[PDB]
């Protein structure tokens, strides 16, 4: 019943942040009292539900040894009016009594939702009482208050003030490493065959949270029980010998229904420069833009330079703009946030451009970061653009993006990267200094880049040694990344179909002659030769010339040069 840091899994950076925030003031009250420092009063943790936030608070309180208290919002609101106030006051008084103490208010938004949302007088009364109690913390002794909420705007804005729940931690969603941590923690009390590799399961289970992974483990265990227990009446020996296998985990993952599939995921991408070879100049430019101002700030301070806020990509579709953005994010170990074009189109259609504020807020909260806008031309393209209607190039969502970029302090090290297949119809108001100000052309991959792409695509496939990706890349000139990925997928499909047909034929052979090895253990190169028959060039020389014309037109004005000091 007493939890510790070991049990807490999924979140490590956030746990360290909370530790540095809370443990030191609690474990050394004299230090903060002696020093002229303001200890934290209210810490607001938000994230999707089921991430073990209450467990995090319990673990922190136990490890720090501070008295812990829990307040469930629905429980408080269940009481009759007047009794809810008594419960809240009693909770805070008890927390004060056993100072140092930590008060956790689970489901805070249920207590103090959006101000307009509350209708009756009792809701406003209890919210005001909570606010009054929060500001009466200085007279107390090291009584930190922690609260859980889905989103920062999901509570009454009055709470997010100084002396109130000002400090923030974003538990968010566990990443692959965090997911593996959670899976290892939950499977601590189960028998698992050597066949299973929890690392692979953690990799596969994208979009899940801690509760979802716990449900998956329970489902796998019960699937094993059903497969084996049904054979028995009941025998305890079977349960003792019960051991789940990777088939059970895969089937359970089939019936998963994760609750965080639609959330926004921020995490250092696993993509690396090797995944897309070539483009050394673009690599250097992205380095100078994103790495130097985080690995060498003193240089910028000494020489008095202002780091560029962001950059804009532009080139043929499916050439690896997202690949390059993710690679540069990986290089600096900075979180990567992608905003696909459909999100911008949804904001435009719903006239809900105000959501652009939340995107930049989330990017700031996870600094350093690389905010990626996959298609800035989507909204403009939706109106024609090249000719379009009689309106100008300005719109709602792009205007909000411009506002947020202008209101972004460069000291936070958040770099905006934009991508577009139609650079012309991009709003000229976003290409000025102080905004996206450098244009990087992402050409079609050359021979070496194509070899690297082909090698990266097949990294997860069983490929025979007889293949020669060098020759295949040499033959395919002008193919984009999408085309090469399509070629690899077609070869894989041919291999799978051949394997299945051979297996069925072998089954029939056994049926007729019921008296082995895999007929196609790996992708033979004849599959690739057959697959190449279905290859296509998504981009055309017309598009290539269009982009080269755009680049040359940008280049014309640079004629000033050959300067010479006397």
């Amino acid at each position: 019943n007493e939890v510790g840091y070991d049990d807490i899994g999924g979140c490590r950076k956030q746990l360290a942040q909370i530790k540095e925030m809370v443990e030191l003031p609690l474990r050394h009250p004299a230090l903060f009292k002696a020093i002229g420092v303001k200890p934290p009063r209210g810490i607001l943790l938000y994230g999707p539900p089921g991430t073990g936030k209450t467990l995090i608070a319990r673990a922190v309180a136990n490890e720090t040894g501070a008295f812990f208290f829990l307040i469930n919002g629905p429980e408080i609101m269940s009481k009759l009016a007047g009794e809810s106030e008594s419960n809240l006051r009693k909770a805070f008084e008890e927390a004060e009594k056993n100072a140092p103490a930590i008060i956790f208010i689970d489901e805070l938004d249920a207590i103090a939702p959006k101000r307009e949302k509350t209708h009756g007088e009792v809701e406003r009364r209890i919210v005001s009482q909570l606010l009054t109690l929060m500001d009466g913390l200085k007279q107390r002794a090291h009584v930190i208050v922690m609260a859980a909420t889905n989103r920062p705007n999901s509570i009454d804005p009055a709470l997010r003030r100084f002396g109130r729940f000002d400090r923030e931690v974003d538990i968010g969603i566990p990443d692959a490493t965090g997911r593996l941590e959670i899976l290892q923690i939950h499977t601590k009390n189960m028998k698992l065959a050597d066949d299973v590799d929890l690392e692979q399961v953690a990799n596969e289970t994208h979009g899940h949270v801690g509760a979802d992974l716990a449900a998956l483990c329970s489902e796998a265990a019960l699937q094993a029980i059903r497969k084996k227990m049904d054979l028995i009446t009941i025998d305890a020996e079977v349960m003792n010998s019960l051991a789940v296998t990777m088939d059970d985990f895969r089937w359970a993952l089939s019936q998963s229904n994760p609750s965080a599939l639609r959330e926004t995921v921020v995490e250092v991408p696993q993509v690396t420069w090797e995944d897309i070879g070539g483009l050394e100049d673009v690599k250097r430019e992205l380095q100078e833009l994103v790495q130097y101002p985080v690995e060498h700030p003193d240089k910028f301070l000494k020489f008095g330079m202002t780091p560029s806020k962001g950059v804009l990509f532009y080139g043929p579709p499916g050439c690896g703009k997202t690949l390059l953005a993710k690679a540069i994010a990986n290089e600096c170990q900075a979180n990567f946030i992608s905003i696909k074009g459909p999100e911008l189109l949804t904001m435009w259609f719903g006239e809900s451009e105000a959501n652009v504020r939340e995107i930049f807020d989330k990017a700031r909260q996870a600094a350093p970061c690389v905010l990626f806008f996959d298609e800035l031309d989507s909204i403009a393209k939706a109106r024609g653009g090249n000719i379009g209607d009689g309106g100008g190039a300005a719109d709602r969502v792009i205007n909000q993006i411009l506002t947020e970029m202008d209101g972004m302090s460069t000291k936070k090290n958040v770099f905006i990267i934009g991508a577009t297949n139609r650079p012309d119809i991009i709003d000229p108001a976003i290409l000025r200094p102080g905004r996206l100000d450098q244009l990087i052309y992402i050409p079609l991959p050359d021979e070496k880049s194509r070899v690297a792409i082909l090698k990266a695509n097949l990294r997860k496939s069983p490929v025979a040694k007889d293949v020669d990706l060098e020759f295949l890349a040499k033959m395919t000139n002008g193919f984009s990344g999408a085309d090469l990925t399509e070629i690899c997928q077609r070869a894989c499909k041919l291999a799978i179909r051949e394997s299945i047909e051979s297996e069925i034929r072998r089954e029939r052979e056994r049926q007729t002659n019921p008296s082995e090895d895999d007929p196609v253990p790996e992708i033979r190169r004849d599959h690739f030769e057959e697959a190449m028959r279905f290859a296509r060039r998504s981009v055309s020389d017309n598009d290539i010339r269009k982009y080269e014309m755009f680049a040359q037109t940008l280049q014309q004005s640079r004629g000033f040069g050959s300067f010479r000091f006397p």
Binding site: I387, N542, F550
Partner: protein, 98 residues
């Protein structure tokens, strides 16, 4: 040369001559039913005639509205941005003419 007797007879025929008609460095059964189309793109008016081809035994040399339209757009408005809309317009016009 264009619209003249060649060295290969026309399987399609339907000319009276019965001989294939040379075109664009290639041998074809018959002659085009050419028709005029006006290509306008971002304040650029151009007049051109598309030499439509049908009645081809090979079945591969018959005119293709998609190929014809893309070729015309590239030839007259090369490297233009968002030319897909112009290609759609031209292909629609050619389809409706026939």
């Amino acid at each position: 040369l264009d619209g003249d007797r060649t060295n290969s007879r026309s399987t399609g025929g339907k000319c009276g001559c019965g001989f294939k008609h040379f075109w664009d460095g290639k041998e074809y059964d018959n002659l085009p039913e050419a028709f005029p189309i006006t290509l306008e793109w971002g304040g650029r008016v151009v007049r051109e005639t598309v030499y439509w081809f049908q009645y081809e035994s090979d079945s591969s040399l018959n005119s293709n509205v998609y190929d014809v339209a893309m070729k015309l757009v590239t030839k007259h408005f090369p490297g233009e941005f968002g030319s897909e809309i112009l290609v759609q317009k031209v292909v629609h016009t050619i389809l409706h003419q026939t």
